[PDB]
Ligand binder design. Structure first.
Ligand SMILES: OC[C@H]1O[C@H](O[C@H]2[C@H](O)[C@@H](O)[C@@H](O)O[C@@H]2CO)[C@H](O)[C@@H](O)[C@@H]1O
Ligand SMILES: OC[C@H]1O[C@H](O[C@H]2[C@H](O)[C@@H](O)[C@@H](O)O[C@@H]2CO)[C@H](O)[C@@H](O)[C@@H]1O
Lengths: 484, 484
């Protein structure tokens, strides 16, 4: 619906604060802003987004956005240099996919260890010593540690500590085929976690609300949660500290780093009003304070407002935990990774499967065999390998008038017969062309390739080759089909 | 350059009149309008258009626009119902390509027979009797007929009379493989034309300006030309009539029908100002009169201004000749057709080749083997043949709880294991997908496919399949490569 903004944001984040920014936007531009927090919005989005039940702006961590973008659900964002300099460049890095900017970076999230200072003046440096500490607190009618086991996000810091990883990065891209879910170190992490359930130290059933209300009512000594969760501990008036996670096997726990991002719906007719709201009303010391006051955002993208929160000890510990972690891949194969790791952790902790079986299946599910779709990078390699073959044929013709073989960035034209139109078969290596067509040049009477009239460019007609509209019309059909 | 309009239009059309409309536009919106008439603008366009040396608006006949559109050089035009009702629907038909509107129809052109009434009170009903009439006029120091032989556009009426054709139309599309350039009837037409050169009735060298200044100075009895050429005959004060072309072999001459169209450069940052100028300033009784006063447009698209010119006898004869002709295919394979037929006519009339050789080569050049690029139509056929196979597997599973195989407009999901995530390999028949990936559904505990949260749609994740962004990023690379 034109002339108003719908905004989806997670239900554990500061949506009431975001509403307050949207109130300010309505008073200043006369435009209604609706902030909504649906269950499972991250899987709700791709289906509904293109139906005008979807929002104008979606908030989530940067990992889901690779898939969204590749679904053609996000508009690309176009901020001017002046605005770009307001946010840390590494946050920009995170909302960058396939060389496009797909979102606005908001804040940087990382799991930390939150401990009850009064129940435990000194948080344990290692995971290994928790069993002993829990067995001690159980005697005092308490538990040592309780945290969301249902979500793979919270258990990963342990599973990644001794050697686990989502996808291997190398030479500036992710290997979708290489997954470190079932190596020696990951088994060590999950085996240890399963043992905690086995030995009655934790319950397998513990979900987000069970473990938070457990911590808030002083029933547990330690929780693992993110910045957003701090507001509730303050209301419950528990004397708490936020600290670096425990080491496992002398190796630091490696939490996934989330950059909360705001994306703009490609289907929204309110794109300009979206940009206007995000750049001028939300990403400002005031706007971020409003959200931050409701639930803490973590380390915000905005450099100016960041320097302020960067004196907060609770942030420092989130940043310390962020440096020790790994930033989540934002590639499309992530949703399979999450489903795989959820299944795995759930099955292992319940007993449905042994740790080794659970992870070996997760290995196979998460890991995708190479995409068969040709990427821009690969296409360019074929183009360079064809340019090469053109240097070669020109060097070999000249080694012993017709127009000379030349390379025009796409084809390699052969010796032209003077006065003639030269037809050359549209090159098979250009993935997108019609390889049955022909491209044309006029080779003039004197052995120079005819020129575009009154210009200094070589005339060539490629209209049999190019299928830009057809490719669109077809691909659009598949998109409409996927969405209506 | 933002905030002003550059307009390319042919040099034999009414560019001074179009300038006058552009003057009016500048006085009313404070926007500078430049009307330019470059040599060979129809082949100049594709190369320069994407360089900001190209125009905002290009005028040409509808045939070249298939190629332009497929080059992604034209913006699609979006006129409202109210405006669409102002122009005849068949002119709209002509500027329609692959189900998009790519231009604005301006006027309808057709070659006619122009005769000097004073040198010849009765124009010859047949082509056969011209030799006798010329041999008579030569004795009086004149010639019977002189017209542009250099361009295939003017010779085609004869070449298409006894059975020639560009591309066979069938079931609402052109067969690029089927060309009637070298059938029995086309040879008859070209043989006859070559005989006129042979027997000294016409000169092979006769180009556009030679033949018009010949007619205007009273040196020839008959010319073949279009509406645009009438203004000069009126200045030269020759008593002329415009009439239906001579029949050949008892068959009417079949001229190509051109719908002069105005297209908007996809690269232009002035698209809105383009639409504004074309809809409100040019396609109006006043605007078209201004152009029409400079050089006649033919039968204009605008119904209201058309009824006026539709009383002009000269138009009536163009319309009569239009009905007897064939409307030019606007497919991309046209430019090859033109190059093929030019070469052919040139070589035959000069003597470089015998008529049969000339046309058999034109046959091979003009005719393209089928496009290998999959079109939307074909992709849908594969989708329907996959839907079919789904009805089939559902009917055969039910012929003898799990979630039931069903068809979701793209894939056909197999029997689901209750409680499980169902992975299904991205379908190989979807040309645009990544056929290595997997699509996902949750089959719930009770044997119903899990639903998109709070909605009535079946949840499915296709993010491994879809490559909408990659396909763009890659194709864009090829476009930039073709243009810079
Ligand atoms: O649990 C898998 C889940 O992890 C991430 O979502 C986080 C989110 O980043 C946090 O802000 C917080 O609300 O917890 C969520 C998990 O409970 C991924 O972004 C998401 O795709 C994935 O499903
Ligand atoms: O002859 C090949 C040429 O024919 C057509 O162009 C015509 C044009 O439509 C007329 O309005 C007039 O100005 O003469 C032109 C050429 O004589 C085709 O439109 C064009 O593609 C083709 O090159």
């Amino acid at each position: 619906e034109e002339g108003k903004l719908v905004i989806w944001i997670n239900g554990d984040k500061g949506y009431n604060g975001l509403a307050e920014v949207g109130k300010k936007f309505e008073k200043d531009t006369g435009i209604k802003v609706t902030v909504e927090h649906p269950d499972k919005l991250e899987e709700k989005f791709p289906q509904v987004a293109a139906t005008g039940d979807g929002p104008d702006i979606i908030f989530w961590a940067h990992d889901r956005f690779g898939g969204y973008a590749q679904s053609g659900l996000l508009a690309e964002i176009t901020p001017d240099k002046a605005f770009q300099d307001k946010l840390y460049p590494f946050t920009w890095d995170a909302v960058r996919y396939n060389g496009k900017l797909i979102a606005y970076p908001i804040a940087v999230e990382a799991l930390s260890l939150i401990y009850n200072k009064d129940l435990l003046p000194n948080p344990p440096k290692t995971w290994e010593e928790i069993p002993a500490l829990d067995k001690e607190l159980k005697a005092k009618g308490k538990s040592a540690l309780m945290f969301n086991l249902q979500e793979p996000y919270f258990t990963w810091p342990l599973i990644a500590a001794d050697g686990g990883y989502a996808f291997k990065y190398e030479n500036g891209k992710y290997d979708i085929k290489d997954v470190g879910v079932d190596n020696a170190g990951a088994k060590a992490g999950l085996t240890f976690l399963v043992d905690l359930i086995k030995n009655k130290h934790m319950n397998a059933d513990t979900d987000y609300s069970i473990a938070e209300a457990a911590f808030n009512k002083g029933e547990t000594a330690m929780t693992i949660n993110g910045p957003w969760a701090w507001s509730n501990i303050d209301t419950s008036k528990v004397n708490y500290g936020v600290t670096v996670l425990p080491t496992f096997k002398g190796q630091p726990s490696k939490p996934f780093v989330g950059v909360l991002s705001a994306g703009i719906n490609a289907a929204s007719p309110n794109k300009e009003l979206a940009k206007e709201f995000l750049e001028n009303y939300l990403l400002t010391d005031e706007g971020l304070e409003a959200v931050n006051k409701d639930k803490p955002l973590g380390a915000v993208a905005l450099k100016s407002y960041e320097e302020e929160l960067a004196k907060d000890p609770r942030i420092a510990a989130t940043m310390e935990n962020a440096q020790k972690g790994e930033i989540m891949p934002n590639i499309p194969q992530m949703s399979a990774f999450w489903y795989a790791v959820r299944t795995a952790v759930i099955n292992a902790a319940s007993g449905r499967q042994t740790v080794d079986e659970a992870l070996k299946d997760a290995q196979t599910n998460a890991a995708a065999e190479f995409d068969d779709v040709m990427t821009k990078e690969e296409q360019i390699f074929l183009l360079h390998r064809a340019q090469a073959q053109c240097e070669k044929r020109l060097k070999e013709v000249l080694q012993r008038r017709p127009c000379l073989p030349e390379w025009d960035h796409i084809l390699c034209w052969p010796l032209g017969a003077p006065g003639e139109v030269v037809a050359v078969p549209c090159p098979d290596y250009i993935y997108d062309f019609n390889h049955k067509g022909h491209a044309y040049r006029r080779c003039d009477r004197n052995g120079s390739w005819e020129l575009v009239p009154g210009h200094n460019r070589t005339w060539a007609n490629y209209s049999e080759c190019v299928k830009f509209l057809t490719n669109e019309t077809r691909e659009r059909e598949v998109f409409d089909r996927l969405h209506h």
